Assembly symmetry: D2
Homo-oligomer: 292 residues x 4
């Protein structure tokens, strides 16, 4: 039997970094969960256990903290520095994947050095280097939203396994997971993150939803229309079901007030909204959620 090494990558995952900026009395906090993985010629490491090409995962971790000493303006720019370092510093390293989760902190009553975690969303960044190409995908996850009315679902086809009732008034609730790919690295990454977040919240709240597919489409369209530097945005939105409870056996009516919030199962509506004519299949999406 003939065996060959295919797609592979390796490194150090979930390096927890906190960078305190204390040049003045008003401190700043940058809180990251960083993953560094390299791609290139690692044939002999796999087939013979030859580690001559294996930049140690411990070394990748050390590089994260050493680079953090210098500071970094944004999460994306920190990842860009790491990826350029590894691809330019090792002849057999031809690319890789560097990703981070950014955790937000609010000041406690605007104190200089006292903070509380904002857990209501997590920011993400994924950078993939392939030779001279650098591709950045920023994102938001864990942002839970809900409309208590202004959502309908009707006109769907019915087969012998269809029992779902049509409705013109229902709760629509989801966890916004969204990732958007930049077509350039020359981006004001923090300002675009704040803008995209506001656009997604606005389009979710203000669209009269006939389907979560339609809501998601309007969210993506609002992003693409406002940001030339973004080629496409992907969203994965669970439909977190709120079932109207039958109170009639207890002698009561339920005028869209009392709901059971189910855990599982849940709708899972996923879509890509792209600028007309842009690249259909960027390679970064192949590993954006993981290798396997």
């Amino acid at each position: 039997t003939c065996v060959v090494l295919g797609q592979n990558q390796y490194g150090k995952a979930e390096v927890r970094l906190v960078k305190v900026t204390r040049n003045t009395a008003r401190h700043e906090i940058q809180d990251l969960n960083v993953t560094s993985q390299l791609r290139g010629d690692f044939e002999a490491a796999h087939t013979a256990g030859d580690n001559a090409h294996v930049v140690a995962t411990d070394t990748q971790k050390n590089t994260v903290y050493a680079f953090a000493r210098d500071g970094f303006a944004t999460t994306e720019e920190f990842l860009l520095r790491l990826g350029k370092h590894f691809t330019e510093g090792f002849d057999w390293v031809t690319g890789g994947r560097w990703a981070a989760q950014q955790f937000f902190w609010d000041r406690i009553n605007d104190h200089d050095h006292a903070f509380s975690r904002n857990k209501s969303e997590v920011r993400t960044a994924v950078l993939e280097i392939s030779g001279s190409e650098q591709a950045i995908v920023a994102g938001i996850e864990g942002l839970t939203v809900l409309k208590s009315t202004g959502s309908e679902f009707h006109g769907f086809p019915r087969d012998k396994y269809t029992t779902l009732q049509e409705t013109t008034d229902r709760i629509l609730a989801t966890d916004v997971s969204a990732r958007w790919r930049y077509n350039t690295v020359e981006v004001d990454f923090d300002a675009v993150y704040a803008s995209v977040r506001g656009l997604l919240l606005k389009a979710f709240a203000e669209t009269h939803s006939l389907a979560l597919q339609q809501t998601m489409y309007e969210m993506g369209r609002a992003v693409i229309e406002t940001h030339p530097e973004i080629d496409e945005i992907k969203m994965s939105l669970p439909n977190k079901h709120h079932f109207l409870v039958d109170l009639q056996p207890f002698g009561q009516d339920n005028p869209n007030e009392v709901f059971y919030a189910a855990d599982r199962p849940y709708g899972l509506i996923e879509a890509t909204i792209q600028r007309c004519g842009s690249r259909a299949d960027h390679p970064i999406w192949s590993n954006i959620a993981g290798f396997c």
Copy 2:
């Protein structure tokens, strides 16, 4: 050998409830995770499988939703109504434990019916009824806070196993878990919750910490001194370590800027702060964290 049924309680746990208030166009959301457990004469249920006294856990669940239809001003008042219902409605039920987690929602851009989850803290309430006595413990959990300076740890004894270096400047980070026992049910539960939350944050931020014990003591003291309706407050604070990274092997210094945020192990500092002369060990605390 002789065997006997000891302490027992039973019911339905984690009933997820959403109550929408839509009498006007400005909707309100109340989002709870409710547990109902009964105590009393359940001997024959255990020793013989005689279910004559076993009010069904399904029935307790149904009662949660049916009662929710009427509305409720606060989480505590809803639990009080449930506990009164079960203890007065069944002769063999002498008490129980009713608990809820309250999840907070903010409006999206002040919209009437569009909301986003505030995940940065979870409110709790536990009500225990014993005969004619009832006790309420309110609480907060999941609130993560951090001081980037203004924390010291020195003067600790040094035994054969002590290697930690004294310091006058370190990060102090914790997850605030706090539960306080009311001495009366005549409380503005929402206003006291908001007050206690603010007091805990303020005392954490403003105390120059020589020990996490001291910070916690000042937090509890601020609560007790401001709220006559509270007899005691228990806190459990992990010390979520942020280790100063050694960058000297790389030719760099680390002036309290670059930190490794460790997962485990962690310090766990726990204390009770009480009003002088108040009850020493109320029974409600014995099962506040669970039965076993």
Copy 3:
């Protein structure tokens, strides 16, 4: 306003320890998650930030690993050594709480030094020292069991909020969480753990269940009747509902075959089975599930 420090304890939680025994070619693995907390005179630590009495949590951790170097026959005996060390080594330490989770490993094809995790149960031990008294509570958690028939629930009272249908055939599924208190430290801890585990599984499987209360009672009774060294056993059993799916809308019957395994809500049935005349409320149970 007069404030006083009440019950308090502090230490290092979740110290992950792996002890390899390699005196011979056949290696052994002991895999523990250890928590060490001290009790005594810590007044000045809380009220003034005086750390003269504060044995550092880092020191407690170091003590765990240093003691592990000597080896230990069982988890309980390792906790006993730690607790005796801290209570005898510091005049102001009068007691404390030491706990561990033991994770089980199986050999891979009976190899000397290659193992795979047995994740189907986690063993627990909690030791509390109070002056000269040493109290040990051993336990099992995470053991999920299911009977596909041989379970009934009928004869329960019906109020206006009761809609549950009686049944003579249903699935009974639970997560066994069980903790038993020894009345002596002179115990063959591994052999009793193996016995108790077998007794609980046997009583679950072989009891024709008219109620989860009855099943739980029989499980505890088998333990108490077999083990003179155990005074009492507490169980907390979720009723993990498997709902019989209604397939009649699709033209099909469902003869107890197709089920929906719900996440929440769930029954939560909790009880104590004790040897007649034994102590009613040992203080260790007050903190067995946590401080607050």
Copy 4:
């Protein structure tokens, strides 16, 4: 600005299914977590809220349970039945992705209808249909393994950020996540699953590891050489670090006995092992870990 709908899929995720086989005294349990997603012409659903093509996610769920009523020989054959149903039954549905997690149960003391969960591994299956082409990827996850010796790491390059010491004796521990793509569906999926699991464990245990890359390569080679029906296998192996504790400050040596099992960070070593001449990149892998 012109906007276009790109890649999209939708359906019902995490349908928890338990199928009891009880036509005779010896009951069998099949315990699945099933996800169904459709692909095809859903343009008007997104751009206009026209649901004429939207087979309801509730309907996909109902189909899971109705089909389960007939029984199914393996998880893969159940997914194949679902995918064939949806792609043939709706003209505008051109394909999709159906996935399942299978949870294993063991008998309690060989009882006919009493079981306990085997939590030590989770089986997975993913089926993708595109037009007339289909592909099945089976897998295993959550299987934790450990070698206490027989692992080395040396010969790696040393840059300015490298501090790791070479070693010839260390612990190697990982969580086996492995997914293999079949080149035909005419197979005994249960027998191949058991075979692959055994081969992976054996190759992990018996390879003298000079690198986790090498161990992973040998595990994949062992699978490819014995299974002509498999074209390729992907693995993602964390290096779950067990650090040799420094006991020298305590006057003790540590001859590879006492280890600290760290949570994060960890090595993450990922590779594909393919049969020579087989398809280099199969589209099923682009979404195998999620959409985004």
